[PDB]
Structure formats: C-alpha cells, structure tokens
Write a protein that binds this DNA or RNA. Structure first.
Ligand SMILES: [Cl-]
Ligand code: NA
Ligand code: NA
Ligand code: NA
Ligand code: NA
Lengths: 216, 460
DNA sequence: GGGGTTTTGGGG
DNA sequence: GGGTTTTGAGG
DNA sequence: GGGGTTTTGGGG
C-alpha cells in the first residue's frame, strides 16, 4: 500500500498512458499538502515527496479574490488545500526542469486552492524530489521502454540480418561501427518521440509572473 | 609546526593546535546556508582509537573533526576510510563527553590528505601513480608543505593504520545498523554492506545493490560524479541513510546531500571478512521474473572470469566514437551493458541456421541438415543509458560459426524446427531478454564494423 | 596578530 | 557538530 | 582594503 499520495497518483498516470480519466476515481479527492517552498520554485509536499503545482490564470485570480490579505509567493511553511486539480503528461527538457525525468513530466494542474493559514502540520521525513525517486524513475523508464519497444517492432522489419559472410573471414575486412546503428522509429529529430499518449496542453503561469503581480 | 596526539591535545589552551590522524568516517562536504559549508569526520590515532575494552565490546573510540569553509572546494572529500589527514591550527574543546577539534578553513585553518595505501581512491580510479609517499593527494589552500621531520610521523602513522585496520574492525557494530532492522529506525542510520551490483540507471545516477551481514538486500541511488569509486564486490560504509516507506516493490535506502559512501583500505579486516562472508543474492531477480512488470533490474548474463577486470564501454562510445577515438580504435575487445529491445530474426526457430564453411553462407534448417553445420545467427537490437534518449537502437551480433558466444544461451546450436526442448529454452530466453528491466553484461569483439558477443553466458 | 596583498598605514 | 543547499543530476 | 577575529590600532 503506497503511503505517498503523489507517488501513487503520478505512477498510475504513467501506467495509464497519461490518460487522467483512467486513473482511479477514489484518488481524485481534495489534496491537502504542505508548502515547502514558494519562490523561486513553488514546491508542495504530501509528507514524503514534493511536486511543483501549476496554477491556471483562473485559480490565482480566484485566490486573490477570496483571500486579499494573502500572497501566494509567501505561502512558504504554510499549508494549502487544492480542491480542484488535474494531472497531465508533458514533454520537457529534463536538463532544465528538475521536476521532470527522461524529458517527461507529470504536472499537477491547480484550478482552485485554499490557504489554511497558520495550520501546523505533523512532523515528517525530509521531502524529496519525486522525479529523483528510484521507483518512480524506473516507472518512467518502463513507460518509455514500452513506447520504444512498440515503435521499434513497427519500424524494424524484414529481418535485415548482417550477412554472416561479413563477420566470417574478416582477416582483410574493415568496417565502420556506425553500420550497426538502426533507427528506432520515424521520429523527425535525433531524439526518440514516438509516444502514443497525447501530450496534455493547458496554459499555466510562470512563478515569476505571479511574483510581479504581487510586487512589481 | 608542532604536532600533538589526539589524546594529549590541550582542552584548556584553546590555542590553535596541529595534528596527524586517521579518518575512519566522514560526511560529504555539504552546504548549510547561503555562505557556509561543513564536513564532519571521525578521527583516530595511536593514543585514541578504542574504548576501555572489558565491557566496551571492542567499540572504537575517537575524536571528531568539524571543518568549516565558505566554499565546497575548500573541504576534504573522504572516499575511503583509513587514509591520513594533517590539520593545522585547530581549536579543541569537549563536546558532549568527547574531544572535538574545530577548524575554520575559511580563516587560518588548513587540512591535507595523505594516502595510507599505495594510491589514493582517485588515483586508483584513473590508474595513476602517486608523486611520492610524502605528497598529499588533496589539501586546502593553494600550497602544502611537508618538512623532513614530518616524514617519520607520516610513515609511522601509516604503519599503525594498517596494523589497526587488520587487527580491529574500526567501524564497530555500534557504528551502523543491520539492513534487516533498518525499518525500525526513527531516522537516519549507517550501513556496512557489500556492493553486489552497480546498475547504471541513467546518465548521472547509479543504482547500488547492497547486502550486509544480516543477509538483507537493499537498493540505493548513488550519483556517478559524487561516488565514482563504487565497485561491485567491494565493501563500503554508508554514512547516513534512511528507510524508504514509499518503496513497496523493493527495499530502498535514501541518501542525503551530506550522506557518504566510504570504502576501506587494503588492510581492513572488516572489509576482508565481509567480501568473503557476504555472498551474491539472486532471490530478488528470480522473484521478479514471475511478475509481468519488475521495478527491479535483472542482469541476465555473466562474463567470463578473465574479463571481470575489463572496464565497460557505453554504446554511445561503441557506435559513435569507436572510429574517431584514439583509445577506442586500439581495442578490438570490449565489455558493455545494455538492454535488448528486439531480437532478429523474429522467429526463434530461425535463430539457428545451417552454415557452409566453404561458401561462407548460412541457410534455414526448415529443409533439414542439407545446409551444413548448425550455428547461431542472432542479431540483437539494443539500447543503453548513454543512448536512452536518441532515436537509435544498436545491433549486437551473436554469430557463433567461429565459436564466439556459442554457449551464450547455455543451449548448443541445433535444428530448432525439430528439437522442441532446444526451441522452448530459447523462446523463454527471448521473453526474458526483451522484458523491461532486463539487461545484458557482455564482452564483444569488433569484427568488420560489427560487435559479436563472446565469453558471455546467461545465468537465468 | 597575522594572511595575502598593495592597502605599504589604517576600518569595522 | 548525527547535518538540509540549489549548483535544484558532488554541494 | 577587507576577513576573521579580538588585535578593537597597528606589522611586515
Ligand atoms: Cl573493423
Ligand atoms: Na592588515
Ligand atoms: Na597590508
Ligand atoms: Na581586528
Ligand atoms: Na587587521
């Protein structure tokens, strides 16, 4: 039984081809999480890991409406409750986004969250980046392995085996190693990208803009 | 400079003192705030190394050293326990019953590391030779000086360090927790286990397969750059680890930015006894083969003993630099790891063809013996960590007509169209090889632009 | 006081 | 000091 | 000059 709500949610999202409607319904309930950081990165925890929530322009305006005396970029060490949220997979540059892995990211889209100001939470272990967790990294590796293996079994065909005469009697035979390079799919670039899941899309605000909106 | 022994240092002087000591434990240099870095380590010497033995239980006694700095690069990285450290201008004080030496490297304090073994960890990793037995392999500030009178101290301390590590455990039982009791700990703890396997999870992370004296197996993630000294079959001490309650598929240990993985000097008694006492475990692997999806990696093959010391080369270098790198061009035999994405030909029954050694041609055995000697002609399409993101799959051949990799499947070549037994074994192997989290550790010989597997056999 | 440095006698 | 940064994939 | 440090203004 998974104790980490985030780990479970994100895991099922991946094991379900990024389809959020296929993930258990008994998991789409309000999320009460501790705010580890708010700037330059807004990171919340579920008691075991931390994740980066992506607020919609609507969510922030609603927030500033019901809570005028509260700045989001100052919710550090405070607790929040996301009543309406959704998940979706996105292709990113893991070299720049530390909340991702293998150029893939599971985003926590926040539509509505209430700030339970001054609510002390129970003591927990030090929160760690979910996309740095051994099991979760492996889960994502399983995701790509399944996508890659499917793509290859569809791209490679005809059993174009190296002619045995090439590796036999190779006394006076020289060859370039790149000859063993085979294209995995019909991908456009040099990076594999033949995935079946449909990359979710949703306008989200950069933590920097919400900073200026509260202090030019 | 006058060097004093740990047990004879003054507790009242509060004046800067200098000493030579053996490092038996140390954290990794970690940052505390926006301007400070710390490195806490345990040190011993001829006058302080073991507690009153009678009811102590042969527990190691020691002093502690806390080095402070403004930069990461100004603190010592202890990869191995048993080496020597020379400290200058350190103030001593009693901290909760034990002598604690403090040194502000950011001010006027300094440290120097000396190798107890022939070479330092870094030097062994790069196969380098130490300038001399009086040269520090690492030290703070821009300069380090060793006076003639010091040589005696350094040499004597080395002789002592070996006698010490070969006679005592150094890392006593009270300095670590048994892996099978790791779940009972409130917070972090220390471990002393053998490295059964080093799996390259990705471009920057290694996944270590640990097993301690308690027989319990655990996995933990070790960054390549932080712990480049991890080696299979070697015994290490892990400073500060925590039990992961969120890992349901496998027992995993969590390490922090200050956690440290430490090896032992050649004379280590503990490291020696454990390298022989702790035997490889495959229970985890065997069990995973029964599941449709295993979050535990499984190395399906084992290379011949003679290649166990051969360094591994990634696919990236093997297929993209093997014709442009001076060092890679000089070698014809390499060792590497990878996972099979697809096996060709598709029909397992065609894996074994008939070979005519005169015309150098192979053919299907669906027509029978009228083709010649039976041989394996399997073309593996693989991938690895170094080529994880690219849109490629690389071919690795298993053509046994000349004897290379003949016993890879543990099944002598044979007409798979008639020998049901042979066919069934190969079919099962096919599913394992292409199964997620399955990898192959093999030695390959480059021949006419291709790599053929050799001296490699399945162990499942 | 003493480093490294240049300030080469004096701040905080 | 038996600890918690960002460089947020040595820190 | 400026740190850390305590010398708390002045050495080399
Ligand atoms: Cl060649
Ligand atoms: Na001065
Ligand atoms: Na000066
Ligand atoms: Na002063
Ligand atoms: Na001064």
């Amino acid at each position: 039984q998974q104790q980490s709500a985030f780990k479970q949610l994100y895991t099922e999202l991946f094991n379900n081809e990024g389809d959020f409607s296929k993930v258990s319904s008994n998991l789409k309930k309000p999320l009460k999480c501790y705010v580890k950081e708010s700037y330059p990165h807004f990171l919340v925890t579920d008691g075991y890991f931390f994740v980066a929530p992506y607020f919609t322009k609507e969510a922030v305006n609603e927030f500033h409406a019901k809570f005028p005396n509260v700045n989001i970029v100052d919710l550090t060490d405070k607790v929040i409750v996301i009543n309406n949220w959704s998940l979706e997979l996105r292709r990113v540059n893991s070299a720049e986004v530390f909340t991702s892995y293998a150029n893939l990211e599971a985003r926590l889209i926040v539509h509505s969250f209430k700030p339970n100001l001054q609510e002390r939470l129970n003591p927990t272990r030090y929160p760690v980046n979910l996309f740095r967790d051994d099991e979760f990294k492996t889960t994502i590796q399983h995701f790509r392995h399944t996508a890659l293996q499917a793509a290859i079994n569809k791209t490679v065909k005809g059993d174009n085996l190296v002619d045995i005469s090439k590796v036999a009697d190779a006394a006076g035979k020289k060859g370039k190693v790149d000859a063993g390079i085979v294209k995995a799919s019909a991908s456009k670039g040099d990076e594999f990208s033949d995935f079946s899941f449909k990359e979710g899309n949703t306008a989200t605000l950069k933590i920097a803009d919400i900073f200026v909106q509260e202090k030019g | 400079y006058e060097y004093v022994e740990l047990a004879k240092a003054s507790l009242t002087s509060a004046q800067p003192q200098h000493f030579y000591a053996v490092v038996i434990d140390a954290t990794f240099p970690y940052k505390t705030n926006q301007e400070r870095y710390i490195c806490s380590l345990k040190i011993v010497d001829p006058t302080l190394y073991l507690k009153q033995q009678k009811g102590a239980g042969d527990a190691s006694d020691y002093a502690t050293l806390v080095l402070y700095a403004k930069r990461f690069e100004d603190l010592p990285i202890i990869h191995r326990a048993g080496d020597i450290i020379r400290v200058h201008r350190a103030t001593l004080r009693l901290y909760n019953g034990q002598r604690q030496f403090n040194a502000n490297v950011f001010y006027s304090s300094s440290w120097a590391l000396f190798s107890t073994d022939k070479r330092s960890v870094t030097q062994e990793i790069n196969n380098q030779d130490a300038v001399s037995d009086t040269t520090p392999f690492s030290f703070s500030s821009k300069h380090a000086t060793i006076e003639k009178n010091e040589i005696s101290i350094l040499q004597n301390l080395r002789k002592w360090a070996n006698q010490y590590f070969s006679s005592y455990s150094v890392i006593s039982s009270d300095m670590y927790t048994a892996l099978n009791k790791a779940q009972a700990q409130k917070g972090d703890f220390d471990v002393v286990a053998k490295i059964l396997q080093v799996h390259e999870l990705d471009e920057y992370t290694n996944e270590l397969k640990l097993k301690d004296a308690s027989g319990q197996v655990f996995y933990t993630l070790s960054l390549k750059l932080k712990f480049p000294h991890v080696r299979t079959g070697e015994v290490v001490r892990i400073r500060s680890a925590t039990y992961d309650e969120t890992s349901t598929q496998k027992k995993v240990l969590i390490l922090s930015h200050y956690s440290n993985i430490i090896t032992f000097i050649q004379s280590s008694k503990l490291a020696k006894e454990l390298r022989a006492k702790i035997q490889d475990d495959h229970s985890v692997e065997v069990a995973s083969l029964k599941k449709n999806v295993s979050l535990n990696a499984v190395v399906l093959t084992e290379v011949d003993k003679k290649h166990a010391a051969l360094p591994s080369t990634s696919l990236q270098d093997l297929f993209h630099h093997a014709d442009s790198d001076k060092e890679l061009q000089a070698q014809d035999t390499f060792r590497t790891q990878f996972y099979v994405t697809k096996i060709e030909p598709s029909d397992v029954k065609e894996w074994v063809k008939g070979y005519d050694r005169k015309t150098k041609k192979s053919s299907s055995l669906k027509g029978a013996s009228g083709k010649g000697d039976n041989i394996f002609q399997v073309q593996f399409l693989v991938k690895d960590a170094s080529t994880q993101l690219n849109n490629n799959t690389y071919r690795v051949l298993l053509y046994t007509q000349d004897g290379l990799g003949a016993n890879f499947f543990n099944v002598k070549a044979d007409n798979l169209h008639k020998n049901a037994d042979a066919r069934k074994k190969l079919e099962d192997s096919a599913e394992l090889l292409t199964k997620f989290n399955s990898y192959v550790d093999a030695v390959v010989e480059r021949r006419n632009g291709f790599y053929l597997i050799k001296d490699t056999k399945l162990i499942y």
